[PDB]
């Protein structure tokens, strides 16, 4: 996952989990990538799937 086309004003609501470096399970890459932007680039991908 590449979050360069982010942010995006909206995300579909399907569930395919990603695990962030904050230990939060992100519901989908769209959710995950908007958080990376809001974090101003500090948040990273830990692994795919639930934390």
């Amino acid at each position: 996952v590449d979050c360069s086309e982010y942010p995006k004003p909206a995300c579909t609501e399907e569930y395919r989990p990603l695990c962030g470096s904050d230990n939060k399970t992100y519901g989908n890459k769209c959710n995950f990538c908007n958080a990376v932007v809001e974090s101003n680039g500090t948040l990273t991908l830990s692994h795919f799937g639930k934390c």
Binding site: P9, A10, E13, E14, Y15, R16, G27
Partner: protein, 185 residues
């Protein structure tokens, strides 16, 4: 299995919109983004209980898909959780609605705008959407939006979350029902 319950494709989990039917043939509606590229649907994460296979999928542009039931024994309730649904109707500004979804469960709010355009990126744009102040989270796609006993829409997407508040856009269910020649029961 009923409106708002989880559905599993080979890629992820979505929510069942509404159980619909045409003649003696049972289907269920869900979100297009969810039926796009999915073939088989199961009722559980272990993928041991089969629901059916995709019969149609419209996404982007619209945001609805339909699945034919191949399972003969599973109960197919014409409800949303326990909520009986008896007709479908058109959303209207100020209308009070409720969404049920496999992740967040039930939440209510109202319709704040119609004929909304949502741009999900890379060319995925959906048109003619119902805007509302109802929250939704990943898992909730395709779940129902109703008002009392009326079917109104299918969850497609948005921003925010249920803890801090959000805006979710829904596909009009009337559009899907007409396209497939199906009706709620």
């Amino acid at each position: 299995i009923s409106g708002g319950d989880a559905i599993y494709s080979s890629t992820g989990r979505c929510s069942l919109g509404f159980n619909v039917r045409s003649g003696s043939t049972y289907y269920f509606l869900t979100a297009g983004h969810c039926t796009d590229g999915a073939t088989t649907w199961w009722a559980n994460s272990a993928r041991t209980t089969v629901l059916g296979t995709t019969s149609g999928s419209s996404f982007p542009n619209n945001d609805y898909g339909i699945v034919r039931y191949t399972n003969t024994t599973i109960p197919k309730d014409g409800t949303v959780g326990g909520q009986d649904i008896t007709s479908a109707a058109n959303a209207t500004v100020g209308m009070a609605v409720t969404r049920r979804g496999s992740t967040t469960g039930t939440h209510s709010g109202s319709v704040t705008a119609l004929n909304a355009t949502v741009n999900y990126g890379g060319g995925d744009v959906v048109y003619g959407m119902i805007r509302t102040n109802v929250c939704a989270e990943p898992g909730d796609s395709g779940g129902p939006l109703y008002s009392g006993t009326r079917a109104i829409g299918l969850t497609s997407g948005g921003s925010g979350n249920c803890s801090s508040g959000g805006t979710t856009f829904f596909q009009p269910v009337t559009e899907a029902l007409s396209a497939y020649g199906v009706s709620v029961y």
